[PDB]
Amino acid sequence: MASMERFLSVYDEVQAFLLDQLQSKYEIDPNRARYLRIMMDTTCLGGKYFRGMTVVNVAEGFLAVTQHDEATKERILHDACVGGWMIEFLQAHYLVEDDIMDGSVMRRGKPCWYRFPGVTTQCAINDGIILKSWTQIMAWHYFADRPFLKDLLCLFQKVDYATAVGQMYDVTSMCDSNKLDPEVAQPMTTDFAEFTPAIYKRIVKYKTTFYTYLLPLVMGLLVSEAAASVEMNLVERVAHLIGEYFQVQDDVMDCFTPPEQLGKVGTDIEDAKCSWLAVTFLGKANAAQVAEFKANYGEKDPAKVAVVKRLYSKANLQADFAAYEAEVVREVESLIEQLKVKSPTFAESVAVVWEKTHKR
Amino acid sequence: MASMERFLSVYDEVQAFLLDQLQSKYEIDPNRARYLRIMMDTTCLGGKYFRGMTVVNVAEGFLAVTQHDEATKERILHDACVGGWMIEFLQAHYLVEDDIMDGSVMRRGKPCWYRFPGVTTQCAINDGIILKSWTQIMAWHYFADRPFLKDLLCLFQKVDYATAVGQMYDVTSMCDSNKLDPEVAQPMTTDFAEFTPAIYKRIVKYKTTFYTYLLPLVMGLLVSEAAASVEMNLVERVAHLIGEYFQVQDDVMDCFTPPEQLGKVGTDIEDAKCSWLAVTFLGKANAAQVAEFKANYGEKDPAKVAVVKRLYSKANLQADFAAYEAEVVREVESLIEQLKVKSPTFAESVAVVWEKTHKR
Ligand SMILES: c1ccc2c(CN3CCCCCC3)c[nH]c2c1
Ligand SMILES: c1ccc2c(CN3CCCCCC3)c[nH]c2c1
Ligand SMILES: c1ccc2c(CN3CCCCCC3)c[nH]c2c1
Ligand SMILES: c1ccc2c(CN3CCCCCC3)c[nH]c2c1
Ligand SMILES: [Zn+2]
Ligand SMILES: [Zn+2]
Ligand SMILES: [Zn+2]
Ligand SMILES: [Zn+2]
Numbered sequence: 001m002a003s004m005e006r007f008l009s010v011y012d013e014v015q016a017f018l019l020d021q022l023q024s025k026y027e028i029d030p031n032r033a034r035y036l037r038i039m040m041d042t043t044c045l046g047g048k049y050f051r052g053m054t055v056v057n058v059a060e061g062f063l064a065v066t067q068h069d070e071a072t073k074e075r076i077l078h079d080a081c082v083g084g085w086m087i088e089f090l091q092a093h094y095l096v097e098d099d100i101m102d103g104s105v106m107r108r109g110k111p112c113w114y115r116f117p118g119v120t121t122q123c124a125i126n127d128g129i130i131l132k133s134w135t136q137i138m139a140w141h142y143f144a145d146r147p148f149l150k151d152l153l154c155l156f157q158k159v160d161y162a163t164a165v166g167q168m169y170d171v172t173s174m175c176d177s178n179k180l181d182p183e184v185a186q187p188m189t190t191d192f193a194e195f196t197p198a199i200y201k202r203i204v205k206y207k208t209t210f211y212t213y214l215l216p217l218v219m220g221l222l223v224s225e226a227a228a229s230v231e232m233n234l235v236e237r238v239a240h241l242i243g244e245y246f247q248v249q250d251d252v253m254d255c256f257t258p259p260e261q262l263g264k265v266g267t268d269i270e271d272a273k274c275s276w277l278a279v280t281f282l283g284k285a286n287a288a289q290v291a292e293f294k295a296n297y298g299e300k301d302p303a304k305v306a307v308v309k310r311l312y313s314k315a316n317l318q319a320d321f322a323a324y325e326a327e328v329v330r331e332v333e334s335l336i337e338q339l340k341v342k343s344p345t346f347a348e349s350v351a352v353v354w355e356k357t358h359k360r
Numbered sequence: 361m362a363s364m365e366r367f368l369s370v371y372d373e374v375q376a377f378l379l380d381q382l383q384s385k386y387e388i389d390p391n392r393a394r395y396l397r398i399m400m401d402t403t404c405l406g407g408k409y410f411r412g413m414t415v416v417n418v419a420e421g422f423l424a425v426t427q428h429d430e431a432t433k434e435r436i437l438h439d440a441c442v443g444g445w446m447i448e449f450l451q452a453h454y455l456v457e458d459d460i461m462d463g464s465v466m467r468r469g470k471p472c473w474y475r476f477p478g479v480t481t482q483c484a485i486n487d488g489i490i491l492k493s494w495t496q497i498m499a500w501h502y503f504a505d506r507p508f509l510k511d512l513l514c515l516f517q518k519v520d521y522a523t524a525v526g527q528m529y530d531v532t533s534m535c536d537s538n539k540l541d542p543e544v545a546q547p548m549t550t551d552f553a554e555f556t557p558a559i560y561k562r563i564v565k566y567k568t569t570f571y572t573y574l575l576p577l578v579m580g581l582l583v584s585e586a587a588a589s590v591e592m593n594l595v596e597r598v599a600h601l602i603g604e605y606f607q608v609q610d611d612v613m614d615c616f617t618p619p620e621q622l623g624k625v626g627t628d629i630e631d632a633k634c635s636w637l638a639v640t641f642l643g644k645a646n647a648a649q650v651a652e653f654k655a656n657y658g659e660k661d662p663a664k665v666a667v668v669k670r671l672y673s674k675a676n677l678q679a680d681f682a683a684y685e686a687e688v689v690r691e692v693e694s695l696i697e698q699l700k701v702k703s704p705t706f707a708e709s710v711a712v713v714w715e716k717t718h719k720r
Contacts, residue, residue: 026525027562031537036528038542097489101482117545122461125485126527129457133521140514153513154500161493165386167486168396177391182398185477202387 003056007049010081015040017141018134039113039127040134043092044085046108051091051216052084054353058220061345066224079223082142086135086156087215093135094163094211096128101171102271106264132160148222155222159215166206173203173274174298188272188298192282200279201244208250209243213353220349229343238335238350245328246357251275252321255309269308272298277312280320289315329358363416367409370441375400377501378494399473399487400494403452404445406468411451411576412444414713418580421705426584439583442502446495446516447575453495454523454571456488461531462631466624492520508582515582519575526566533563533634534658548632548658552642560639561604568610569603573713580709589703598695598710605688606717611635612681615669629668632658637672640680649675689718 019037022028028036059080063073098104099112100121106112114124135156143149175186177194189195217235221227254266255277268275278297282290293311296304332354339347379397382388388396419440423433458464459472460481466472474484495516503509535546537554549555577595581587614626615637628635638657642650653671656664692714699707 022525026522026566028525029537031540032528032532035532035540035542042542097485101485103482116542118540118542122463122531123528125457125461126524126531129524130521130528133517133524136517137521140517150510157493157496157500161490161497162386164486164489164493165382165388168392168483168490171482171486172392172395177389180391180395180478182395182402182476182478206386 003053003060004049006077007053007056007081007084010078011045011085014082014085014138014142018137021137021141035118036127036130039119040131042110042116043096043113043127043131044088046110047088049084049088050356051212052081052088054213054216054349055084055087055220055223056080057352058217058346058349059224061349062220062224062226062229065345066226076223079143079146080220082138083152083219083223084216086138087211087219089131089135089138090156090160090163090211090215093128093132094167096124096131098167100124100128101167102267104264104267109263148225151227152219152222155215155218159210162206162210166203166208166210169203170207170274173199174272190294192278192294192297195274195279195282197279197283200274200276203274204244204247205240208247209239212246213239213243217350217353221346226343226346230339230346231342234335234338238332238339241328241331241335242350242354242357245325245332248276248321248324249357249360251277252317255312269297269305270300277317280317280324281312281315284315284320285311363413363420364409366437367413367416367441367444370438371405371445374442374445374498374502378497381497381501395478396487396490399479400491402470402476403456403473403487403491404448406470407448409444409448410716411572412441412448414573414576414709415444415447415580415583416440417712418577418706418709419584421709422580422584422586422589425705426586436583439503439506440580442498443512443579443583444576446498447571447579449491449495449498450516450520450523450571450575453488453492454527456484456491458527460484460488461527462627464624464627469623508585511587512579512582515575515578519570522566522570526563526568526570529563530567530634533559534632550654552638552654552657555634555639555642557639557643560634560636563634564604564607565600568607569599572606573599573603577710577713581706586703586706590699590706591702594695594698598692598699601688601691601695602710602714602717605685605692608636608681608684609717609720611637612677615672629657629665630660637677640677640684641672641675644675644680645671 015037018040019028019033022033022036056077059076063076068076095107096113099107100114104112105115113119113127114121119127136153139149139153139156143152146152172180172186173194174188176189176191179186214236217239218227218232221230221235251268251273253262254268254273254275257266259265268277278293281293285293289311292307296307296311299305332350336347336351336354339350375397378400379388379393382393382396416437419436423436428436455467456473459467460474464472465475473479473487474481479487496513499509499513499516503512506512532540532546533554534548536549536551539546574596577599578587578592581590581595611628611633613622614628614633614635617626619625628637638653641653645653649671652667656667656671659665692710696707696711696714699710
């Protein structure tokens with residue numbers, strides 16, 4: 001059976017289990033069950049399922065070289081699917097809450113969940129909470145007796161926490177760190193001293209890389225009982241690297257991809273994001289370019305957003321991106337090489353993750 | 361050492377551990393550490409600590425009748441304190457998110473967290489997320505090797521989920537169930553057919569009783585390794601009953617306690633809450649009283665909120681409250697009696713929980 005139809009079949013199974021359990025144990029009525037079904041479909045479906053399918057792909061690699069009964073192969077593939085949906089629901093939680101936090105309008109060519117007429121922020125914040133709670137309901141039901149439950153829950157917990165810390169890094173990236181104070185309304189940075197590669201790297205590592213690359217790879221190893229087939233430090237280092245590349249590509253597309261293909265109107269410039277474009281521009285700008293950037297960045301005024309996009313264009317950031325990309329290819333190829341020492345199979349799953357990221 | 365100074369000492373220990381771990385493992389800077397310290401103090405401290413201290417009290421009861429080394433007594437008391445702070449942080453999460461959801465202005469005589477000038481909703485939603493993530497960081501660090509970790513995490517998970525489901529029950533309690541539809545803006549009920557005791561009971565059981573009474577009692581039993589000293593069905597039934605009484609008292613105070621003593625201006629009437637007052641009023645109103653209620657309920661207009669408060673006053677709901685209270689006393693005394701069959705110690709902790717609720 002093809003990996004994707006297995007994954008989607010498990011979505012239907014996990015949805016039915018969750019909604020049936022709300023009816024049998026949580027006293028839910030049919031109308032609220034329907035609302036939660038529709039919230040689940042709207043918030044969890046419609047992407048590429050890259051994160052969840054990575055768990056499945058890693059598990060498939062190990063199945064091709066490991067002796068098991070047929071029934072055990074089916075159990076491992078089911079477990080990989082459930083663990084993949086745990087990550088897809090964790091993401092769904094963060095996308096719902098982030099869209100509310102950032103006052104976002106669209107995602108994947110549809111209104112943000114909170115903007116649905118019958119939802120509103122009051123409901124959406126709690127729907128987000130429910131989405132993350134469903135990750136734990138899935139785990140405890142499907143993995144109750146599994147030898148990897150402890151390790152999976154502890155990892156999942158740490159990655160969820162890392163993500164929430166990265167969110168804090170991201171929402172505060174345009175503030176001066178010395179001025180952060182719950183008692184005082186936060187002015188935007190005037191110097192942009194904190195728009196550095198190391199500070200950018202810290203945001204992306206916590207907000208994106210742990211849940212998008214580390215967790216899917218390590219969960220594929222845990223459901224496979226294969227974590228001692230790998231050097232965990234190499235897994236962390238290659239996750240780091242690939243996830244950062246993913247986020248740099250995202251940041252470039254925010255500014256330069258047509259809205260019709262992006263699924264939204266990019267607002268990183270108006271939101272004064274610590275973006276790869278802003279850090280890379282400041283890393284090569286002359287004094288006049290820096291001064292014009294400070295005059296225009298972080299403002300809704302379309303004229304000022306256009307002055308920032310023209311500054312980025314004139315600054316030939318395509319060159320910097322090509323150089324960054326070439327350095328990432330060297331380093332990720334080097335880490336895939338080191339991974340082949342303890343597991344060729346796992347090294348090959350990382351190579352697939354990298355291919356799917358590099359030209360998406 | 362007095363229970364309360366032990367509990368507060370552990371807050372300082374757990375705060376230091378969390379902030380030190382953010383610095384050693386999550387690359388946090390001093391200014392963001394200070395912001396999170398202040399968010400933790402502002403959102404977790406200043407209440408009565410009833411929920412957390414219940415874990416400590418249940419553990420203290422078992423210590424008085426169970427042979428242990430001194431060091432083991434100290435470990436159980438520490439564990440009860442950490443488990444109590446897990447519930448206090450879980451509550452803090454829900455109070456932050458609920459204040460944002462409901463557009464609340466004050467809590468405990470201070471602005472809601474999201475309303476602090478240097479916070480805003482963008483940050484506060486994520487601060488709420490962090491608060492619940494800290495529950496899991498506490499558990500995994502302090503309880504890593506504990507025999508009760510599995511059972512504690514599974515219970516905690518289910519109670520958190522129940523609470524989020526109850527939130528959904530509460531925010532949708534003024535909608536007609538058949539009209540719930542994410543695609544369609546929700547009108548307020550015109551008939552109030554769903555303002556019934558059974559529907560009220562469902563809201564309160566899920567939103568309040570699991571985290572405020574069931575979880576503290578059962579966590580005190582888990583850290584004590586004493587869960588087979590009790591009939592879990594009796595624990596669920598007495599938690600049910602006491603928690604509902606707590607929420608009925610809350611609802612009455614929303615309408616009738618001066619704001620200076622409430623710590624806020626009650627808005628349940630304007631928010632069209634399915635409150636004990638609204639259900640109890642509709643349970644005894646004549647046709648003209650019901651019609652005037654429908655004309656005025658669920659509107660910001662102070663004149664209309666005053667018409668609802670005068671309707672409640674004229675309706676002598678004090679009588680209904682006295683009758684309800686008398687029925688709760690019978691039933692809770694009956695359940696404390698049944699609990700004494702398997703554990704007198706535990707029965708006595710439930711009696712203390714009830715006394716502290718009954719005349720607060
Ligand atoms: C699709 C889905 C997720 C992402 C992210 C990652 N960020 C999402 C926002 C919430 C938490 C921060 C991480 C960048 N681009 C995306 C395209
Ligand atoms: C500035 C920097 C880089 C680029 C690119 C190259 N793109 C490759 C497609 C994947 C996403 C990365 C961007 C096109 N326009 C740019 C302007
Ligand atoms: C102090 C603290 C908590 C409560 C509640 C319980 N509700 C809180 C709001 C969030 C989740 C629903 C439960 C009622 N009155 C309170 C006084
Ligand atoms: C309507 C219903 C009951 C009452 C009470 C009795 N109060 C006892 C104090 C604890 C909280 C419950 C309320 C005073 N005014 C009321 C109006
Ligand atoms: Zn965001
Ligand atoms: Zn982006
Ligand atoms: Zn509320
Ligand atoms: Zn209330």
